[model samples]
Target chain A: VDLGTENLYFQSMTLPIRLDIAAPLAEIVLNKPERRNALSVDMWAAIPGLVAEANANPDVKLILIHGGDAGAFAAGADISEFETIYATEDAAKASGQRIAQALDAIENSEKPVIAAIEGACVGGGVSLAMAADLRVAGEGAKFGVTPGKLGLVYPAGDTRRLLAAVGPGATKDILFTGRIFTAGEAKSLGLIDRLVEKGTALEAARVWAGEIAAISQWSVRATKRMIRGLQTGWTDETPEAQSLFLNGFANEDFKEGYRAFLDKRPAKFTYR
Target chain B: LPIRLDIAAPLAEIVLNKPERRNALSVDMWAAIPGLVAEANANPDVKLILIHGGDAGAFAAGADISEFETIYATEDAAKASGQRIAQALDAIENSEKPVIAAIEGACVGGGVSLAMAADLRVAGEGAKFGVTPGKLGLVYPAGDTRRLLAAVGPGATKDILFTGRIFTAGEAKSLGLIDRLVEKGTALEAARVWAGEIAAISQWSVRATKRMIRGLQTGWTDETPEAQSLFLNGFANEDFKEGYRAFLDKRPAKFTYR
Candidate 1:
């Protein structure tokens, strides 16, 4: 499948990846069946640019990442890549740096990222799952963070990201005990926002993405930016953070978002 | 004579004893709160610190405006006085032991800052509360503002700080200003019950929860890896184990801070 907007293009085999400007949602599928969709450095490296491109597009309102197969979402970072990516402290840190940058891009995107999960999502895979603004998991899914058992400290940013999604108490318990929890437990702890019956996470995500797309893109983007700004202290109170907010408010998107809301219609956003 | 201390089992009560002037806080009294609280913290017999107003009522009207001529007479003096007040409040907010403020009558301006500093607060039903730095052409110290925003979200903080309006205990409770509301004379008793509950918990867990929450609020880049490592080193402490055990056993905790 090929998903492109303007000159930016993403091509993948064995998964259904689609892009819609009318609704402004980008949906991507994890394509590696041989490894049960364990993510590789290449896969992780591709995300930031794609997300940035989506953010730049006036039509893209949300990004959805889903597992291609029903058996597993992402088992974790590909252990096969561990020999190449985590063979030494330097190698591990370098890989962590890239992962951190990618996560930051997703987290800071103007539009929200939603993870639609099925089956197993573990270890560093959990990091990617949590980086999204919301996680919708299938009922039978199993989740875990295995760094503690492996004697490797989870990346600081990843730990904090998880803590932000779930409270510190839940994060500590997960880290210290290294337990694998069911999707039900995950939802109760606010780790996952919504859980569908087995095999329907992606469908739920698409419906949500469509619902989100129906709203004014400008308002959706502004709200996402504002909420992110508050968490990050990026408000008028802080000069630098305020600039981000003010710039957005001054942008055409802000007007489109509000006008659409008042008109009771979908927003027609324009490229900057 | 702006402050008074009363010793009681499980709690050492620190009263803003200036009711003749609506319990207005002077510079010296602001300086003394942290010191007295520290003394109470070190006392093995005391498990909580209760800060309240004297008998005539009025938690504290605000920083004594009488001293404003000397303290706020110049920008430098105003800054220094504000900084001192912030430090005292920070001490209470950051205390290892939970601090409770028993607020009756009026709590305004710097008095609001003091009450907010406590871990929990019980206000009398008709207690009048306000934070009025704006009225005096002053900015609340950054630390105090952050504390206020943390307790109540930015919207409420802005409404209180921007308008300098007095609010009723019911309104304050809705805004999370007061954790509990009681009849006029029962604030102290309500606070004592609250303190007794806290006293029964494991001290180590209480301290750990506080540290974890504080660390969670800092910017991720502000603390280096080494600094975080040291901060999390508490997880390995013997006291952590004792605390967890005491928690499971539902017993009082014995802690040795590392």
Candidate 2:
């Protein structure tokens, strides 16, 4: 657990994955400002346990990944580290496998994560952002995957997510050329959900996450799960997925939501 | 092309040769498709397929509504007719070759299903796209609904399905129905150009990646046991050897998988 339970701050490495708890909103900052906050091997190893801790916290209704303040989300994976780690076939496979696990962890997390991106989001940076439920990006921000440039085999997990975000055409375009896409192009391809001013991405994320926090978490989470299932032509969606529906009448949040609607006021939903 | 088609024989240039009824797909025409797609798939030279209306002004107006009284008036007949269409789509979708739909106009109802079955869609700016089963108080098959829902989000799918409105090519492009939007009357040309470019790439990489996309969309796990086998097999392929050398030599990889 590179990031185990309930630590407001973890200072084990040069760039620790920090979880800042803002009740109803948990802010996770990817801190590696030097080299434009490129994801190091240590950083990759830390995300799953770190996010698990965030999901465990009932205080957190929304998990936000704001990885940039000094004009960068992340340049990409620390390419320098590849020299030693990916020097051998077995080593490279292990490294890729671990990173894929980390990505799967973020993607499969029950607590939804939003990537607040600005500046450059390339290679693994793009993968990190895609792992989140939604993204808030700054205008003029750059996005691309450069596995083609390195002649590396792109993993199925990441590629599937990319295809889900953008359709086959744009996915192929990005992979074929390893070209950086503009904020507008990414949005056109249905990758970025929201775009803000150059420096307002985090602010926008805070606003949006706060809005989601005000909604019913059960419904949001279920919708996310169901939509993912539907994309895969999957049915029989966890019959337990219907539990919230069946139990909605008993939940205090539901009562509040119903009453709030009758009163025409914003609902203050608490239960997850 | 043999059974009441206006033209045929290694149709390198066009498809749906019937121009009357805007090349409306009749029961016989629908029945002829699976065998043709299978034959095309088996032909090694046929790396990519172009599915478009031979008529310049139309792709397909839809199914032959005239046959509705004869083929779909009864419960059994309707069910069987739909199965036939779905089966043809299955053949096209399951083919090893990439199929592109070039639409000039009126890709509606059955036409929508036909285009949706293809891996890619290119539409002329003047073309209109929609599914209007709601007009006949109809519901689409689950596969059709799923593909529609996946292409657009739930809200968009509901809007289209419920309201039964026609969308312009630009609108369809924005909603993910049309992959490419080209100038009016040039959809076939654009699709051909795209096909040519895609064909230049290694068939192994193209087809393998296509399979994963199909698999991922088919609601199956990528972690399936067979997933790794295809990927690993690529390591020993002619394309892989050419790909590496081309990278080192600063040239385009020539990838003939002999």
Candidate 3:
């Protein structure tokens, strides 16, 4: 099914979102142009299935999430859903859990998931972008967290993730003011990894992903899991982590990788 | 012989003064620091601590390198030495009052560790920053590694740790290493004003928030009942009374964290 085609999507599916999968890469497009790509509840619910599809495809080595032809990456959760989905405090927890689950799926993917942020990456949009391995933004991109305006405090995990992206002082400043930052300001603050020319974030991500896709996927997968262990605090996971290094020696991908390195040809890795 | 504390009510200056060695951190000074920090933390009149080198030319150059032979030649000794220095940094980082670093020129190596441990930092214009554990063929202290990693992220921290290259304050500012960039010769003055502004807020809120911030940095990733109590406790505290009274009087609240 993942053979030599320009595209091999899991199925022809149509909704507010699109999952376009091909060998070596996949694109998950947010398609609600009517709302400037704001995520409705159905869109959030669709994430796990789509991401699982990407993860299962041996040919798909990278996944990119974007706003498609819409100008904004995502305005946030469709505010209209709040009354139905988050009317009560107990009900609010359900909505939060759905978002957290979707974000976790994106975050814990073995393969890299990049967010090509164009315009108005705010609130829930910021959380989605932060969930990705990297964020590439357009020159005129705007970013903000924005909960303070509604008199709510941020969840600790999101706060910690933000703290990791920026730092304590900047995190406090960003949360306190609820101010929107320009792409230049966001890059300086680690809110986005880099900013390309206007309307070029997705193309830049594709080019970068293609560069990574050509490398030994075996090494990349191991390094990603190991680095995550380090980020999660290394004390709890030991022998497995060490094995991720030592076991690579006996692994077939390593032989191919090493031989390819010596032969001076780009490695076309078969292992995931 | 280098570390000194000059305290005035609600403000204190902890000066690194050994200009002879550019105030390099000594093991003896590290040994004495906990008791000194306790002295400041216990002083009811002090609300903010400004740690700065006496000369507006250099913060601490780093740990006194000469002692490496005597202190860290063995694995056990190296571990012990790191532990002692870490104890001092932890004390500063864990203090109830806000700690501000007023950085001038040459904040390198151990200097970066010290500044990174504080609540916030303001650097003088044109100052330099570097982390050189790679150059020494040594690992950075784990605590300092985590702090630096949080301050500058993996990429920028890697650039600092790997290259051991000194960068200008402007570059450091953009990298999220320094919070505020002030004109040269004025780091301490600007820090004083900023600390005064912070001091005007409720000390209870500041202390509680500082504690929670550090906790979030290291361990806690989610809410806890005890942590929830922190916010709830704020409303019943005397500071809340003072806050309302000041609001009614239309003047700044001088909160005593009762």
Candidate 4:
């Protein structure tokens, strides 16, 4: 599925490029097979805005992405545009800043995101995949951070985000060595949240998303916000971050959640 | 006039007393702290250093800006003066005995660093706290910044340093700025209770533990080979053996500071 502000597209064949969904639960594919579904700077920039639109829409509850050929989800960033866009240090820095902003937005979003990888999630591809709250990889999946090979320093912002997800030690080893690892190894290092059999990652992601969707929306959002806040030294009680807690308490979803709990029924949240 | 020290058995109380100036830091007061703290450190009877603000109900409003013309008028002068204040704080922070901040009122600017330098901080319900370097068009000293970062991670440190906003006692506790908050007028009493608790422990082990923590805080990663040698040296001390034996016996370890 391709989630786009202009139009939403769904496909089982190949991954689609720059697909924006108006709703949250969209199953999208990367359609650019000729370029191995390498996400361009434009695609990277559109993600956060599309995610915001999806988060606001109640119909969208989860997002799923996969490779077009079942060979790989994304090979990496498109190098074809590098000559024009990443031609200078300043230009590269500008592009990196945009990418970092988008990733931060995704990581900070209220709704949870999940990524399913079958193979070859490398370089910027790995960065994008790791941005999701949860990731499930297939047996054939391979992951690597390729900046060392390119003789470029990975942007500090991006490196920090990766470090927070996986600890500083693991990040150093990966960035320094630029070695590729199998899906099993990724799961062990906490790079991947879970692993699935070959060709089962997409379905596994959907099941995982459904489980997450079953929980109280308000609680889920609060939990996500609180955990993220903890990482940034913003505890649940910090005045600045307490606004979310207060809003959660006053939200209609809270009432529905409690009502369902007392009545012995699954909560049908008012807000997605 | 700005700060006063009172020594009692097992406790050395340091008070920020200049209520008229809101206990704002002055050169004389800053100079007096190290001397008083040194006295407390040398006194065999003193176990805990209780630092607090006076009855005027203000911890410190910050350094007295009136003296800025003379002390901080030029960048070089400000840096030199700030170094002296930081050095005084370093003495308190590095003391062999634990120092606790009994904050009952405002804790702002340089006062924030002083409170944070202590091993622990207790605040009263009405206490208001802030770190105001941004407001003064100055940056916090590197040592102070590191201490703040150690107390609260980079994000909260940035929030406090960048905004320079006043926070309530409840807010400060929640952010891990202050360890505890008591009802109004009970901060010093709580500090006394804490002093008694700490006084029960063997002085040698406590001192060693504090030294270890301080070393770790100044960027000692655990995996370093040097840390292993340091740990081995501690194991060879008589106090370590007594501390272990006391733990096994369920009794207070009697330690002679050597």
Which candidate leads in lDDT?
Answer: 3
Q: Write the per-residue lDDT of candidate 3 for residues B1-258, one digit (tens) a residue.
A: 588788977888888888887878889888877777778888999989989998736888788866765675555666567768878888888988889999998888899989998889999997888875433334455566667767778545544553456889988897889899999989999999999999888888899999778767656656766677877887888999899899999998877772
**Model 4: CAPRI class:** incorrect
Pick by DockQ: 1 or 3, better one? 3
- Note the Cα lDDT for every prediction shown: 0.72, 0.73, 0.78, 0.73
Candidate 2 lDDT, tens digit per residue, B1-258?
512222222223338866767777888878888877777766666677788886537888777766765775455676668768767777777767778889998888788888888888999998987775434324455556566766675435543553346778998897878798999999888988898888778888888888877886655575776676777878988899899899999998878761
Better of 1 and 3 by lDDT: 3
Evaluated against the true structure, the overall lDDT of model 1 is 0.72
TM-score of 4: 0.54
Q: Write candidate 4's Cα lDDT for A70-94 as tens digits.
A: 4788888888898977789898888
Q: Model 3 residue A96 lDDT?
A: 78
lDDT at residue A84 of model 3 (Cα atoms): 88
Q: Which ten residues in a row have the lowest lDDT in candidate 3 chain B?
A: B132-141
Best by TM-score: 3
lDDT of model 1 at residue A10?
40
Model 4 regions lying over 4 Å from their true place:
A1-40, A43-272, B221-226, B233-252
Residue B215 displacement in candidate 2 (angstroms): 16
Locate the minimum summed-lDDT window of 10 residues in model 1 chain B. B133-142
lDDT of 4 at A54: 66
Compared with the true structure, what per-residue lDDT tens digits does model 2 show for residues A61-93?
778887746588878888789798888999888
Top-DockQ structure, candidate number: 3
Write out the backbone clash pairs for model 3: none
DockQ for every model, please: 0.03, 0.03, 0.04, 0.02
Stretches off by above 4 angstroms in model 1 are A1-11, A14-23, A233-236, A241-272, B1-258
